Symmetry: C3
Subunit: 735 residues, 3 copies
């Protein structure tokens, strides 16, 4: 009832002073104030380019070639400053200054006294400022250095040079994609990109509450849950404090346990009844339960601290296939609550190049995966680690999370200084995320980094989850169809974004892609949205993937912009849909497919199926119809085709299915089928049809009508005849 | 000025494996005897204090840092053995070529060997091929023959003795012949011995009284006729006198490093504290013939 | 001011496997040539002093930290080769996009290959596909063909 702890936000308006970084970087408050620079208003959480654009000092980086105009600020320093009132601290309490995100190399001062030196963009930074804080008004100053210039303080190994990830990224703990990628612009940025708060703690406080599902019995509605509790506990308070442990759901108390605190750290085991297991989408309900622990004085009832979260009773195992194709990647399958689950989902890339806006995108971005019905998502190591709320949403909606540690495409230093920086980061992120039921896998894609540093962290701080040391042309080419990986990471096909997105990110004279009307030659602004990392004038490159892919499927590249959008999105839609159906149709050998990708992190031309502004490409709806719990699909056979139905649930379903020709209306097949639980079931073999065309699949399950299709024949097709088949099928609108 | 051991534990963040074991979470990040926090066979009595000797030592510029005696080979029927002396010293350079090591093996006044060697460097290996020496055996398999091994540093001209190290060694070889836990056998001087003995637990919850119990407690093993004793990792390491008695009565010693009943930290901080401890205890005890096994 | 190398060895407690070897115990904990303490083919002469050149060097803010040449592949029959240059430089941020790297492979004054690239970052990997070059062979197996490889950091505006 009575609250003896509190958290006061330091978010809001700050003062931001920026200037070019001298040869000797500015480290002190006196140097930052004596330096000659520009002072503007800043918003925390934020990025400095946001503050600068609000002051009219930079142009919108999302339009045209404006991204290259931010180049000089990579060599700048950034000085945050504000005042704050210190909260009332009683005798023994501790005041903690909390940073959710400092980007990156910065000296932190409170009342002119240094309290910390941050050097990791991806993790939290907490400082005990109890003794340095004064009565009344206090000063908080953060002086950030240039991340790019920090790289030259290090001598690189041979393996760290020439990778797709930037050499500037190798010796520093930052998201590698911020230096530029083929799917993200170069925007190093800086600033306080997550919350800054002031926490008041009691001498008796919870240091960590670690919930672990030892076992789960779904049929009996039981589970065994362990609580690893670490606290600060003055010895005078030993035997005078009790832990109050509650499992509840919507106010209704499931279990209550109280235990006297005779030592600072304890293991409490809870044997629960009447509790449902946590399942990913399709395989059941994502049952969640409020788990709460409080440190309570046994005499006065004083609540010294309380930790509350929603946990899910679930076990996860990575069943390795060590018989078939030893050494091949993807020879494994996820086992959730003892059931082998078929994984299907997207790779997760940055939500925004200015990551202070990540949090405002996460609700609608997770809703993309919910509408798609992904049961898994892989957080790519090129991005930052997402915050707690992303994993809360994945807990709530039953989306399993595969978490890469933040590494780019390359090899890294084997020396002690880098190993210590990565270990501190790994321990921080693991302790923070290890209680979310949606998280199922750590990945660190011999190397000391992947085979020793990260493995020792998972071994000591998360024994409950598996760890993995390591991770164009025609879509029916043998490079795709002959891949024997059970669990594949699909490469992705390009898709020209919607017209409204093109007209929003390109200048009016650059909306049309063809330079001087020459089909195949991209203008300079389209080359920038390749993404082109550096401002280098050249022709061709990554954008030629759009034309070469429509030239294989449709023979010729349309000159009209609207017809080019249809051709490009159609190739992307057919390719990605074909890859999902190919893996779902070849179960039980195939065990999962994680495709690239569902959402852009910036207005760009990419292989994502939905752009930065929420513009869904045609591939999104194609993929949606092949991601259902029960899906009737058609795989190519040696002679003819094979109508199949795949089931990613633990329940049996029945229904009827009808396969017809879209152009002639003739019935190729129509029969009743039994879709057995958690397996692929072949229905019937279909003969080869004459020439090109399309087949329409119409199946009915439990009074619900679902629709699919299959494009038969060999390319090249005629773009206008394919358009007629889409309209005559009645499933997907043209545009 | 001693601090609270229990409270020191809260200066550390424990890994999952260190929580919930039978050994106390307070024991996991500190280098103390785990049984002092309580056990099923020992009371909780954390205690504190200067529980062993406090002395002032005066050393000369020339001094012996370590005298490490190693038995390379033994031939009991021929009454021979090859003994190595690994000698480390502090030696000013002006004292190089001016000091000699005097190595003497003796048994009850009878001198077995007297070798003198000019000190030309600070560390040296002296091989001693001995005659008329009996091998060291555990109880039942023969005599626990011990010899006084003495090394002294002596000025060549003035004859002044700068330092002297003296202990009783035994000429013995130990091999662990492997063949499921416990699939091994101790080979002592080439013979396969059948081991029979007890585990060794704290002599007292107040460990400053261990030294007053060790004579009678070892006599329990002599009356019992144990030929082996396993010093439990829940206890402190026994002092030199315990191993002196085990040398004398022919009781082999299997020594656990001081670990509780659970997994420990994997971070560099704990590894550095444990390495320092292990180097200290190994150098202190590696010269006793009774000691035959280290266990982690 | 140089100290005694011999006396430095007594700052270290030696392990058992470091005592009794052919090399001196004084050699085990120090980073010196072990033969200086004596061997069966070299006398004992510890010595001391500044035994190699001492120089004062002046470096520009734009300077080459390391030029690492690596032969990926070679085809001696076709007189072709693939050479990589792992270049690490010191580069103030003001000089980013204003300096170019100039790479020249030559032999006895005749130029074989030349490549220019704008320095956009401090470290770079350059790939050179070379024609008309001979492979390096040990004695007997061919000629020890060498080529002068030069890299320079050049101001794109003034040519300095």
């Amino acid at each position: 009832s009575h609250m003896f702890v509190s958290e006061q936000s330091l978010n809001g308006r700050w003062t931001l002073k920026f200037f070019p970084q001298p040869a000797v970087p500015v480290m002190t408050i006196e140097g930052a104030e004596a330096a000659n620079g520009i002072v503007v208003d800043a918003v925390v959480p934020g990025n400095v380019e946001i503050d600068m654009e609000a002051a009219g000092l930079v142009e919108d980086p999302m339009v045209g070639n404006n991204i290259y105009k931010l180049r000089p600020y990579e060599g700048y320093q950034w000085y945050y400053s504000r005042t704050f009132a210190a909260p009332v601290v009683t005798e023994g309490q501790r005041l903690v200054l909390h940073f959710g995100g400092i980007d990156t190399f910065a000296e932190v001062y409170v009342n002119g006294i240094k309290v910390g030196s941050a050097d990791n963009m991806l993790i939290e930074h907490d400082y005990d400022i109890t003794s340095v804080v004064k009565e009344g008004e206090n000063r908080l100053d953060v002086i950030i250095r240039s991340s790019v210039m920090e790289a030259q303080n290090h001598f690189l190994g041979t393996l760290s040079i020439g990778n797709f990830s930037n050499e500037e990224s190798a010796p520093v703990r930052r998201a590698p994609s911020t230096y530029g990628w083929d799917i993200m612009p170069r925007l190093v940025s800086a600033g306080l990109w997550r919350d800054v708060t002031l926490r008041v703690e009691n001498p008796v406080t919870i240091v960590d509450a670690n919930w672990v599902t030892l076992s789960v019995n779904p049929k009996a509605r039981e589970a065994s849950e362990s609580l690893y509790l670490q606290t600060r506990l003055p010895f005078e308070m030993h035997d005078k404090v009790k832990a109050v442990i509650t499992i509840s759901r919507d106010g209704r108390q499931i279990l209550r346990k109280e235990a006297l605190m005779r030592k600072f750290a304890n293991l409490f085991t809870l044997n629960l009844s009447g509790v449902d297991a946590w399942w990913p989408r399709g395989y059941g309900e994502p049952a969640l339960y409020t788990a709460e622990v409080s440190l309570v004085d046994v005499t006065s009832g004083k609540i010294y601290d309380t930790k509350t979260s929603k946990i899910g009773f679930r076990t996860v195992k990575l069943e390795l296939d060590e018989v078939n194709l030893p050494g091949q990647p993807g020879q494994f399958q996820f086992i959730i609550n003892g059931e082998p689950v078929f994984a299907k989902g997207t790779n997760w890339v940055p939500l925004d190049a200015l990551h202070s806006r990540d949090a405002s995108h996460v609700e609608e971005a997770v809703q993309l995966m919910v509408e798609m019905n992904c049961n898994i998502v892989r957080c790519w190591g090129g991005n930052v680690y997402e915050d707690t709320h992303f994993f809360e949403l994945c807990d709530k909606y039953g989306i399993m999370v595969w978490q890469d540690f933040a590494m780019g495409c390359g090899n890294y230093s084997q020396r002690d200084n880098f190993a210590a920086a990565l270990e501190k980061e790994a321990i921080s992120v693991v302790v923070k995320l290890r209680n979310h039921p949606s998280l199922i896998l750590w990945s660190g894609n011999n190397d000391r980094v992947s085979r020793q540093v990260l493995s020792r962290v998972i071994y000591e701080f998360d024994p409950t989850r598996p760890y993995l040391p390591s991770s164009r042309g025609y879509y029916k080419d043998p490079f795709y169809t002959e891949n024997p990986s059970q669990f594949v990471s699909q490469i992705g096909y390009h898709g020209c974004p919607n017209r409204e997105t093109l007209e929003r990110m390109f200048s009016p004279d650059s909306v049309n892609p063809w330079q001087n009307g020459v089909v195949g030659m991209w203008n300079d602004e389209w080359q920038t949205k390749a993404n082109r990392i550096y401002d280098d004038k050249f022709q061709g490159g990554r954008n030629d993937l759009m034309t070469n892919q429509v030239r294989i499927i449709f023979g010729e590249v349309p000159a009209d912009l609207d017809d080019f959008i249809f051709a490009s999105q159609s190739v992307q839609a057919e390719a990605m849909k074909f890859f999902v159906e190919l893996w779902r149709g070849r179960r039980p050998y195939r065990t999962g497919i994680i495709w690239w990708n569902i959402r852009d992190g910036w207005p760009l031309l990419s292989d994502a199926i939905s752009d930065y502004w929420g513009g869904k490409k045609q591939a999104f709806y194609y993929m949606q119809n092949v991601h259902h719990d029960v899906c009737c699909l058609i795989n190519p056979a040696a002679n003819g085709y094979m109508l199949k139905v795949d089931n990613n649930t633990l329940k049996d379903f029945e229904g009827v299915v009808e396969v017809k020709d879209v152009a002639s209306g003739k019935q190729v097949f129509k029969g009743k089928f039994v879709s057995k639980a958690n397996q692929m079931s072949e229905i019937a073999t279909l003969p080869m049809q004459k020439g090109q065309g399309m087949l329409v699949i119409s199946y009915r399950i439990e009074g619900n009508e679902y629709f699919n299709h299959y494009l038969y024949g060999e390319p090249p097709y005629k773009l206008d005849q394919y358009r007629k088949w889409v309209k005559k099928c009645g499933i997907y609108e043209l545009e």
